[PDB]
Design a protein around this ligand. Structure first.
Ligand SMILES: CN[C@H]1C[C@@H](N)[C@H](O)[C@@H](O[C@@H]2O[C@H](CO)[C@H](O)[C@@H]3O[C@]4(O[C@H]23)O[C@H]([C@@H](N)CO)[C@H](O)[C@H](O)[C@H]4O)[C@@H]1O
Ligand SMILES: CN[C@H]1C[C@@H](N)[C@H](O)[C@@H](O[C@@H]2O[C@H](CO)[C@H](O)[C@@H]3O[C@]4(O[C@H]23)O[C@H]([C@@H](N)CO)[C@H](O)[C@H](O)[C@H]4O)[C@@H]1O
Ligand SMILES: CN[C@H]1C[C@@H](N)[C@H](O)[C@@H](O[C@@H]2O[C@H](CO)[C@H](O)[C@@H]3O[C@]4(O[C@H]23)O[C@H]([C@@H](N)CO)[C@H](O)[C@H](O)[C@H]4O)[C@@H]1O
Ligand SMILES: CN[C@H]1C[C@@H](N)[C@H](O)[C@@H](O[C@@H]2O[C@H](CO)[C@H](O)[C@@H]3O[C@]4(O[C@H]23)O[C@H]([C@@H](N)CO)[C@H](O)[C@H](O)[C@H]4O)[C@@H]1O
Ligand SMILES: O=C(O)CCC(=O)C(=O)O
Ligand SMILES: O=C(O)CCC(=O)C(=O)O
Ligand SMILES: O=C(O)CCC(=O)C(=O)O
Ligand SMILES: O=C(O)CCC(=O)C(=O)O
Ligand code: NI
Ligand code: NI
Ligand code: NI
Ligand code: NI
Lengths: 251, 254, 259, 260
């Protein structure tokens, strides 16, 4: 990544890199997804491809592809590991409410905490150290909010205050809007490099046709592969990720 | 009731560790020793030292100690995350043994195309009245350590919040001697009695003096998204390779 | 006796995350008209930028603006982002006409060459602790005219530049890019529109400026800078002096240095 | 033209991690003699601490100390820990005899009540690090002009790591009715520093520090020079912000003098 790209990833929490994969490559990726099973993730009008690398050698190798790994290296700067690799296929009336955010809250029963160390990032001696980054590979054009554009709360990756708990305001900000909520439009083939510290989601998709992407999650070698945990287990051997406040919790 | 007091949290924050005296009684200690003598050990690579690799696996006693509330309660107060047990091991040491310095907030690591100076496994922070340290140990001592010749725990003052690397420079000059042996202006010792726990932010640069006259068990905790402790040489070409890759330690140079 | 938070949780969130906050309609049209009429009575200086007039020290020149500088409607939000014993560091006015512009300045990690090069300016280095922001240098901009399009010379800022860890301007100069980003554009350069009577509360760590003004009519604002009591009142300083008694502010890279 | 770093890698490491640095033998015995002689010919004031005399403004009072304040043996290490365009903020002297003491002051996270709120950062001493450089806005060079080799000489003391403390220390002690200074009672992380005449102690004012009670005969003597950025005002004590917000000075957070 160039100095300007590093500046932009640092200051905004993400980076769009245009035309990483060519038209030939893109259609090849579309083909494989058509020939692959999906699940209901409990999100309306949304089909998920749960584990792309363990479902297809096309995506098992994309996960290790150099166009992805190299910019990821430049923002993680740790010995690297694959944490996850999934696909999303969306139709009209689907939506992805806000999640992420550097200072959102979590009640741990006896106490309330406001840092999630899995996304807590820093900077030292000319290098970014972000522990959890996604490479989003868009396989369809998203050029207006009604295409279900990616959206993000500006600067939320470095926020010191929690946003969502005070609102719980049962309407999502991706629908109602927010003064610092901005949209990002992408072309098929583009890659969005994302600091998972960013509070982000997508607008509601109102257009017809399929919205398609493949998401790959990376972190240091001492991170576990991604897995949802309701809470820490009684015998302290339960592994996984316990999310702080997200809009799904009250919208 | 908070596990750690105001003063205790202040001390852990400012020094990187906390000795809590008399956590486990005579009988408990004797029990722990008795169980240790039962169990197999491996050659950990350090002379006059035997390592009990996976105590919770090899013994129900230490499977139970690892979850003891007297360890978990203070550990919670400095991790403040959903918790996982990352490791649990024992160390038995005789005269002539030594543990060189390791840890350090800003020690270096060569990755292959770049040099990095943060280890996120030990990178800690503070937010709204709470410490957030990702990798902490509860060291449970099973023998008295009251002098440097007992092989006392020692640490580099403030090294858990260091912004500069210390060890690479020493090696570049060719200082083959360990600071635990030679001394260092800010290297200090800690003395404990058996049954005490030393609660340790792993970001701290620490080791032990050489023993001349030694029983402890160590339990490592972190967030639920950390993998259980395993030594890793480098990232695999597979990126499925899991483990912890340490930055500079004295063992690499001494 | 009946204190109410000057800033809401959401307002603090926005100021923290973006480095500024627009507070709408702080001053009603009557007060705005009063401020305008008072500026009409005052003289200006040439600040070295074309089509710009500066009212150099408004609290010294006017009881109206001396009062404004201390108005609780400005001080109360300022206290919520500085959170130190307070000092007024400057108070000035700007009147701009067509073809005037204000190049980018500020930024958290811009460079300064001293036998060494440094990348922090401690006058704008800010932090957060136990539920409170601590920003050492903040401005309250009171707009006395409507700025509703870029062509009105809108305030613009580089997104997240108040917490930037990398320098932006030194490299653009090295690459010979000698036109301002406010004219050329930049991917994360964004505009802010305001109405007369609005206040823009600004962390001076933010890299900001304005677009070039193309429209008719006077663009008018008054700006008040605040910091801790141990900060000196604002004065430009070229370099530390030989005797180490020189006081003032030595800015890091700004676009004016090479555009 | 032939610049070598004022501070070594190790010296920077130590200053960063401990909040201070003792630089031995910076000034020779003859120079120390020159400084002592000059102080004897200058007037003091009563600073309001028992058995303590203060020379309030040495660089104004005498060209010798004006020159000392600008000596590169002080300025070069100061520059390496401030890393800003520099200004001299104060220069004073302290002469102490037996039964004198200096209670703890400083500390990164001590509290200050401001009427409608309590704050826990003092931006005059809030310091950071970036790209290989320390940025500490308020540092002192203490030039010792006598030997201090035991606690009863009134040794400098400090709370370990207090320059980077995230919690306050003094307020809770006061609330728990502990009105005995830690320099008298001790504290688990309170440490002492011994110095020789001619040594310089370079000090991050974020560090919580003071001295032990002096019991010994012979004057305890030093001169202190305070430096920070050009936009800092010269040091002046200030109780509160002023009515017109034009008042300049430094409003300290909790110090032991408030409680003990
Ligand atoms: C009832 N299950 C929900 C329980 C919530 N506590 C989770 O935060 C939520 O999960 C989140 O959902 C939001 C939408 O509301 C996004 O889908 C987030 O994106 C996810 O899940 C995130 O983020 C994860 C991690 N970034 C955070 O653990 C992984 O990357 C996953 O692949 C990814 O779908 C689950 O859906
Ligand atoms: C040849 N193998 C060595 C490879 C080095 N790169 C390691 O850093 C070193 O490992 C370290 O050894 C030092 C002694 O020189 C301490 O023993 C450290 O303490 C250890 O290993 C640490 O720290 C680990 C983690 N804290 C860091 O990975 C785990 O807790 C281990 O169980 C624990 O013994 C290994 O021995
Ligand atoms: C030769 N004169 C220029 C010398 C540069 N080194 C200054 O940075 C520049 O000063 C800056 O100019 C830009 C425009 O190019 C803005 O005007 C900045 O805004 C200023 O000057 C700032 O910022 C100052 C402080 N924020 C920074 O010291 C004060 O607020 C001033 O009132 C305010 O005009 C001067 O004009
Ligand atoms: C009733 N007057 C006291 C009021 C307190 N609020 C001050 O904190 C205290 O001032 C402090 O006193 C302690 C002793 O209790 C040390 O002397 C500190 O050191 C001082 O005063 C500091 O620190 C100042 C700055 N470091 C902080 O403002 C300057 O360096 C001074 O020259 C220096 O004496 C005054 O004495
Ligand atoms: O669909 C997008 O553009 C973003 C997807 C996302 O944020 C996620 O899957 O976590
Ligand atoms: O032996 C001790 O006292 C501490 C042991 C230790 O530091 C370790 O094994 O990591
Ligand atoms: O004119 C504006 O809108 C902002 C002016 C500004 O940034 C300044 O005066 O420094
Ligand atoms: O007397 C000393 O050794 C230190 C004095 C000091 O800390 C001060 O003057 O603020
Ligand atoms: Ni997401
Ligand atoms: Ni260890
Ligand atoms: Ni400006
Ligand atoms: Ni002092």
């Amino acid at each position: 990544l160039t100095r300007e790209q590093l500046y932009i990833f640092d200051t905004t929490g993400f980076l769009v890199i245009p035309g990483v994969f060519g038209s030939g490559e893109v259609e090849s990726f579309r083909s494989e997804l058509e020939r692959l099973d999906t699940v209901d993730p409990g999100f309306p009008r949304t089909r998920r491809y749960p584990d792309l690398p363990a479902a297809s050698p096309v995506f098992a190798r994309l996960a290790l592809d150099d166009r992805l790994l190299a910019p990821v290296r430049d923002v993680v700067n740790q010995p690297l590991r694959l944490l996850e690799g999934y696909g999303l296929r969306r139709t009209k009336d689907s939506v992805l409410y806000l999640h992420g955010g550097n200072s959102e809250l979590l009640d741990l029963g006896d106490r309330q905490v406001g840092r999630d160390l899995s996304i807590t990032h820093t900077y030292h001696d000319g290098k970014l150290y972000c522990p959890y980054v996604k490479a989003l590979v868009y396989l369809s054009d998203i050029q207006s909010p009604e295409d279900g554009s990616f959206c993000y709360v500006q600067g939320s990756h470095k926020a010191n205050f929690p946003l969502l708990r005070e609102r719980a305001e049962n309407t999502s900000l991706v629908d109602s809007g927010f003064p610092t909520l901005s949209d990002v439009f992408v072309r098929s083939g583009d890659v969005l490099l994302l600091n998972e510290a960013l509070m982000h989601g997508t607008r509601r998709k109102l257009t017809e046709g399929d919205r398609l992407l493949t998401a790959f999650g990376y972190g240091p070698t001492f991170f576990t592969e991604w897995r949802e945990l309701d809470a820490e287990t009684a015998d302290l051997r339960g592994a996984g990720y316990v999310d702080h406040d997200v809009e799904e919790d009250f919208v």
